[PDB]
Structures are given as C-alpha cells and as structure tokens.
Amino acid sequence: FTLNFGPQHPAAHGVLRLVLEMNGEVVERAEPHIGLLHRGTEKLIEYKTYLQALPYFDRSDYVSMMAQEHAYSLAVEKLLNCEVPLRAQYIRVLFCEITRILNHLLALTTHAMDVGALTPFLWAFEEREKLLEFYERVSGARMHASFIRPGGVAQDLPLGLCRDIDSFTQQFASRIDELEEMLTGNRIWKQRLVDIGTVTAQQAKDWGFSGVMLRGPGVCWDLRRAAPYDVYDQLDFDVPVGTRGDCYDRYCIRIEEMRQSLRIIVQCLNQMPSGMIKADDRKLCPPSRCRMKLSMESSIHHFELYTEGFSVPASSTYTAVEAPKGEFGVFLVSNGSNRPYRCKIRAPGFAHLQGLDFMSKHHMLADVVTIIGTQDIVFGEV
C-alpha cells in the first residue's frame, strides 16, 4: 500500500516528497524523493570564482547559514595555505556557534511543531530573530550573510556587537530552559519521541550519519573534538552524546548542544584578540576600501580579487566541519584556475535522509514526521 506522504506543514519542510509503502498504519518502507530542491549548485560553482562561489554555501543549508561558508572557507584555505588571524578564527567560531544555536533553535522547535507543540516554535523564533540581529548587524543580510570569506572573514564586527551578544548569552540559558521545560518533561513528548527512530551505532556509521545522529547512538564523534579546525582546540565545551539513539536522545543532545554552543559563544566573547580581521596576504584577501583607494598596489589586488580571484593552486581536499546538521564537508577539487573544479558538497541530510528508510520502518505513519524532524532534514543540502 503506497502513500504519497508530502510536505505536511509547508514552509517548515519544504519539498519533502516521501513515497511511503505502508502496512495499515505501520510503515514498511519510506522512499524519499530528492531533486525537488536540486538547484544546480554543484554545477554553478564550477562556473564562478572562489569568491562568487561563497554565497551558494549560505544557501546550501538555509537554517544554519554561516556553518557552510565556514566549511567552504576552510576548503579554500586548506589549498591556499592561507593562515587567518586569531580574531578571524574567534569571530568565525562565534558565528559558526551562533549558527549552531540558530539551527538547533529551528530544528528543535520546527520538529516540535511537526510533533504538535506550537509554542516552542514561536519562542525559539523570537530567539532566532534576536540572533539575526547579529547576523544582519555583522554582515548585512539576516539569513544569507556572505560573511566568512576564504581569507579570514568579510569585515570586522561593529563596535557594539560583543556587548549585545553578551546581553543575549546571559538571557539564553533561560530560553533553552523554557524550550526544555515545555518539551523535555512532557509525557506527550517522551511518548512521541522515546524509542522513535532508534539508530544502533553500527547503522549510524554505515549510513554515514556523522552529526547529532552519530552522537545519539553513542559514537563520541564531533569534528570539533576530532579535527579541531579553529580555536576549538582552545575553547572548552563538552559534546553531549546519547545513550539510546532514539529521537528523544537526539532532542536532548540538540538541547544540550544548544548550551555548549552557549559556552563557546561566551568564551569567544570573553577571549577575542584585537587583531587583523582578514589574512594579511592581500592576494587572497581584498584590501580594505581605505587602502585600495590610497595604495596603487592594493587597488590592483582589489581589482584582480573581485574580478579574477585567487587562483588557488591545483589540489583536491575534503574539508569537513561540524555543521549543525552534521558533518558538512565540501570536497573541493581545484584546477589551478581562479574557478573551482567540481566543488562537491557532502551535505548531511543527503546521508541522513537516506536513514529515513530504515529509521522509520515499522514506525507509525505519524512518526514519519518525527523522524524527518530529528534528522534536521533541510532540502537545500539534498
């Protein structure tokens, strides 16, 4: 018995087009259909410079924007050998972590709105509209902040942003507590989530989950502890790791990972060195407006970096960061030219949404939206 389970609530899971082969109410197999959001991203990037390539990444995962620009930047610094300053690293993490918070605040309470709890959605989205007052203030666009450029980061924080991020972090433990007091204790929540989509660790490894769905099963594997790719080796934070694997562990993790991300934000705030914002290598970082206008040699680079590009040397690397969805890695083959060459984007949600087939076997049809909830399936990456 085949059922074309589509997007239950649009605007939350946009193009979800599962084709469930059911058995009464018990689902026997879930066959997701991809491509409804397949923009030509892995082709369009081959046609544009390494700078023009960056805006696609904030548009790859639309609920955790800067994590993908941070995964791309670290793939055009893996090749460029472009050492970025300490302040660029600290800002880059303070925003990758603000993005982890922006994602878990959505991927928890959009999940909690698919399950049925209507209010956590709107509380978490007031919180997200506080964090977009930081995105929009530091770069310009509330969602797609093309801000974490290859060398360092686009431009320094405004002169009042750390004070505001602090005044937000002080009041954010309470918001997590409310999102938690409203959902963690509920017997209507546990019942809707405990023993739902349980993934034994061998399955989370096999299906390349590598995210909050690889730390549910108990595999202690965070690419901020495994492969520290910034000040992360300096910052202190504990990676919460589940013990059962059910969608109630992944929720409890995403609601603790939203507190450890608060620890990382507070650290990045309390220790942010007053250094240069971009790599001093002005052939990888366009010089400031003031310098390119006054200096002829800076003007030449501002011209050959906003038209030509880097021309990062010939290589091929797989740089993977811990994006909120999971291990978002961008395999970036680079022909010597200024344009990338098959900038393949390993995006979790392409490996997670595979897991829907075995996660939601023998679960009731109303659980198939809870699974899609805890996978944090955002179809931009799929």
């Binding site: 390119m292 206008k293 006054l294």
Partner: protein, 71 residues
C-alpha cells in the same frame, strides 16, 4: 547630451554631464592635485593625481571635477 540620452529618459532633471560641467574648476597651488573624492579619502574614488601643466583645466576622469594651475 546624446550619450546621456541613452539611459536617462526623464530629460527634466539636469543631465549629470551638465551638473559637472557647471561646477567651476578648482584653483590649486602645485602642478599635481589629489581629488581623493568628495572630502573623505575613503568615501571618494581611488586618489587620482592630475597634471596641471596645460593651461586649460584638466578634468579628474573619475569625478569630472576640474583643476587649474592658479599660478
């Protein structure tokens, strides 16, 4: 003008060419000027050093402003 008749169809607001051809040329001292832009060297064009050896005013290519030697 005719070039300005390609992008502007208003023809009531003065054409930028006239707005810059009606500003007087700026007297200066030396033989080279800066014309960094409006006033703020960071909100104007890249600094363009103009030569004033000729008698006629030498326009700044980026801003249209005109400079004369003022000996």
């Amino acid at each position: 003008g005719n070039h300005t008749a390609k992008w502007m169809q208003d023809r009531s607001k003065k054409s930028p060419m006239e707005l810059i051809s009606e500003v007087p040329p700026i007297k200066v001292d030396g033989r080279i000027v800066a014309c960094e832009g409006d006033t703020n060297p960071a909100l104007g064009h890249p600094i363009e050093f103009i030569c004033l050896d000729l008698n006629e005013p030498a326009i700044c290519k980026y801003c249209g402003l005109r400079y004369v030697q003022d000996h």
